[PDB]
Design a protein around this ligand. Sequence first.
Ligand SMILES: OC[C@H]1O[C@](O)(CO)[C@@H](O)[C@@H]1O
Ligand SMILES: OC[C@H]1O[C@](O)(CO)[C@@H](O)[C@@H]1O
Ligand SMILES: OC[C@H]1O[C@](O)(CO)[C@@H](O)[C@@H]1O
Ligand SMILES: [Cu+2]
Ligand SMILES: [Cu+2]
Ligand SMILES: [Cu+2]
Ligand SMILES: [Cu+2]
Ligand SMILES: [Cu+2]
Ligand SMILES: [Cu+2]
Lengths: 333, 333, 333
Amino acid sequence: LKLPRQKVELVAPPFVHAHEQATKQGPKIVEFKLTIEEKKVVIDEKGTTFQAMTFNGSMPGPLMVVHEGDYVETTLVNPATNTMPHNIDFHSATGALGGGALTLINPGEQVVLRWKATKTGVFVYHCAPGGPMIPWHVVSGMNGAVMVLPRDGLNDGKGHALKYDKVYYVGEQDMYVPRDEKGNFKSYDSPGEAFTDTEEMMKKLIPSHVVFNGKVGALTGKNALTANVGENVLIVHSQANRDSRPHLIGGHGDYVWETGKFGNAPEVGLETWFIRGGSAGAAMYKFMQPGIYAYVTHNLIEAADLGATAHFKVEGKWNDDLMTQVKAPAEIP
Amino acid sequence: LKLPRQKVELVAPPFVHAHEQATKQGPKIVEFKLTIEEKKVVIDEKGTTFQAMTFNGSMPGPLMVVHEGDYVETTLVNPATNTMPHNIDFHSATGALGGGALTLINPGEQVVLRWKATKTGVFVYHCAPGGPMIPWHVVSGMNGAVMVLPRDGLNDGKGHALKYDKVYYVGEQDMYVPRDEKGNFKSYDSPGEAFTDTEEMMKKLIPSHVVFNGKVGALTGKNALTANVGENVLIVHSQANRDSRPHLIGGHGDYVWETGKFGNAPEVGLETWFIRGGSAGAAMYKFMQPGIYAYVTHNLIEAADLGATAHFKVEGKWNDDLMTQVKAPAEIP
Amino acid sequence: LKLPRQKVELVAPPFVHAHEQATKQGPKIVEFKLTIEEKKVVIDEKGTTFQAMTFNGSMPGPLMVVHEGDYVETTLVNPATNTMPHNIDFHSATGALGGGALTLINPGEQVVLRWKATKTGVFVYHCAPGGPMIPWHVVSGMNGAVMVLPRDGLNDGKGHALKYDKVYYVGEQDMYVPRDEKGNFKSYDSPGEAFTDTEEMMKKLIPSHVVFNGKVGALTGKNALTANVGENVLIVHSQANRDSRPHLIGGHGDYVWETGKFGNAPEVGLETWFIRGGSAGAAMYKFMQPGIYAYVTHNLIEAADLGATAHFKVEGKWNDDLMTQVKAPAEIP
Ligand SMILES: OC[C@H]1O[C@](O)(CO)[C@@H](O)[C@@H]1O
Ligand SMILES: OC[C@H]1O[C@](O)(CO)[C@@H](O)[C@@H]1O
Ligand SMILES: OC[C@H]1O[C@](O)(CO)[C@@H](O)[C@@H]1O
Ligand SMILES: [Cu+2]
Ligand SMILES: [Cu+2]
Ligand SMILES: [Cu+2]
Ligand SMILES: [Cu+2]
Ligand SMILES: [Cu+2]
Ligand SMILES: [Cu+2]
């Protein structure tokens, strides 16, 4: 395989490494490295801890971006400081359980997998060692996404280009943290020690936390997402295990690929869309008003009470034609 | 803003205020009033009570119907007989969290919001005061829908008009009523007193009741929905917090907008469709047979056991070509 | 009704009785017989038992295949060895609650129903006696599917024929088996005796088991699904009560009708699709690589821990252009 090689420097979510949309490049071998990290992390503002397992230290793992026809060559590294075997499975790839059957590595090992990007869209990747370990590693944080763009960039299905000014990757994670008898969340010394209690809870199918970017409030405050009025923003949303229903409060999905695959035309003008568990989707919106927006799953219990809220802070001029407060709060006549 | 003004007299669901489909009118300011009512109501045939909070005294709130390009001017009134602050957020609107950030009113106050109807479809509206109050006010009943029609009326995506003979609005509500130790549903003296137990249950994500039009059996008996053979009926279905899967037992969705947005062509000939939590959808069906139909969510446990069943009573002539009992029940030979 | 009559010999899932895709036949009366069987069965590898109720002795019931415009004439038989009344409701049919209102039969009785196949797609059929019995009979196993093909066969929505080389029917069943105080699954002497405990659990909405073809591991080992590289396989997936998110691990959905209705064009290149509870869908894939694939619902807890995994064993030549292990596991440098 004698194609040019291009290295990518991955960046932590919700940011995305620099890439072209439409390109005049032909197929390349695009080289990525992912290093697995098992670590105890804090997941909420009360200080609840969690035995996480991650690609590159983040939940979600970083977004990888290539074009249709590229070959994706991933070096997966499992350092000796980890305790368990791991692998990687790409929903974008064809064969060998997505790559999982060719990438099982013990602590202290690495492996190199190449796959051809023959299908366009956004796709989940995740660890999948085998058996009951599969859901456990996924819900512990071992999932991310890849985006495979058409070489001509995105289009609206009617012959018009859609170009985004920026892209963000929102990875949603369902977490299962057991409680003790008095009702406090339990802490564990190792992923192995968390396993028995965690599996019992997992099989009851109700998460304790549903978070974006690994923690309650991760995409708020100094880390709110940003835009300006007039900017077209692409939001890639993934959920490797459980359904989600994204919604931009105060906005819309102007162009939405809820099943996430660019060979299908987008739907237009959505209020709320649906990300099937085990998939990624994408939505584009051109901001028309300044101020704060919330990006949520629109099970509002999960959004407000279990962690699944991000903010956008948008700069620009208020449009009174679109919306105006005609009369401020006042006493009823 | 010097456009003509038109007042609308809202009607209680499942009925919808009179409106045009295709229209020769240009944009207008369409004026609506919603008055919030907190009240204890009965939700099932066993006499279980519930601390409801409503727009205009109903669950769901009434359907508001306008055309693309209209300006919707809503007077929201929070009488002094209520106990909590409230607001309103329209998924159809652009900016200020859908209007929520401009409409927070204490008991004794009112506010007037105007928004331009730039996106067509059916959309949820709901209360959203802030923080954990958001899911609580929604699942207590503070949600409804708005329909924004194209000025040319509905079409099938192939150049043909779809015209409905009647429209019904089915609002589905997930309710969370706690139980006492012996397993009976609890009653509370105020919404505030219901809050702690209700929030604990809400975060476990399993409703005690799933109802149409506010109560088990609301859309049955004297209040069954009606049609005649030959009539094209539009059913608007909303769910502000939790997914639903509508199904017309004995019929179909001839033309369905499950994501609810009229800039997309409908799908045809569905058995069951899907309403994402936080959205409204719409389905049209031309009745071909008389008799009783059930309209359900097709999680049949929720339909039969938790409350989510409506009936249609349809008049007309039976069509033996479509279906016939060839041999009535008889002893096996 | 003076049309030719054709008998069909039904076969047990996941296989499908022989049929034509495109046909030069005109409408016929196609005759099917279903015999209800109530029986205690084993549902997992630990030996948990379950009070099943079935059409033709299987979960799911067999797939019935006809063409648009055919008349489907079903003889439903309820032998005297059963204990309860039963009926059948077809989502493909028009009127009388899908046929349910014309087919209620006591043990010892049979009935004959005919319906015209006016809508194309895959559709659920299920028992629906009345009231709380409806969900109970469905989740006890009394559901299957019918496929109504266009007379010209399937197409891609762009004028090209899709022809499948083989079709499999995967019926997914959510099961509710109660536990005793010490946490073991309970066994019951009759469906009637299982009813009270089972209904209590059902209303909590969380299944104990989620299985394909009636049992954990049913579609594995000697009973894995099979294909060869180059073969186009259609997978029909039904779920009569609860949502599912099918995914072919290591493959894709090349052409997918997730709502299951052939008057709509398929979507292309999906990773995971969505079967609404109360529906059937269909996906086609042309295998490109040999080896083992898993077909799952991509709630991985349900797939790995509650039973919802099937295998495909695929023969043929490995394609190193699509995927290759560049460097086998080795020590980190
Ligand atoms: O945007 C993708 C869509 O656009 C088209 O190429 C042109 O309509 C379709 O063939 C494709 O499904
Ligand atoms: O029904 C709405 C659909 O109808 C069309 O206008 C004509 O096909 C499309 O552009 C639109 O998405
Ligand atoms: O595959 C079904 C689809 O194919 C067409 O006949 C041709 O595009 C459409 O009218 C239909 O919805
Ligand atoms: Cu792992
Ligand atoms: Cu996967
Ligand atoms: Cu409120
Ligand atoms: Cu909302
Ligand atoms: Cu039955
Ligand atoms: Cu049904």
